Design a protein around this ligand. Sequence first.
Ligand code: FES
Length: 97
Amino acid sequence: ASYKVTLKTPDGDNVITVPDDEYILDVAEEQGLDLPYSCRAGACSTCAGKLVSGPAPDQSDQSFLDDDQIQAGYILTCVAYPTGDCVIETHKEEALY
Ligand code: FES
């Protein structure tokens, strides 16, 4: 299955198609977007984004955000799979400090 993921970047909004078994960061980069990252292993906050609408992405592979933050919609985009059409704001790391 695939989903329409709207990424709202500081530069502009981009609607891309992401399959249910690929990570959002991976697919965004394939489409020419430049999103932040460092570890790419779910263990830091560099790739953080925030869910604006749509179902929550599958974060079973993330570990850095606290249960509280997954709670509130923060997403580690490097290890997040989409689970429905959704809109995510990227570059949100500063927001977690
Ligand atoms: S780049 Fe470290 S958690 Fe995604």
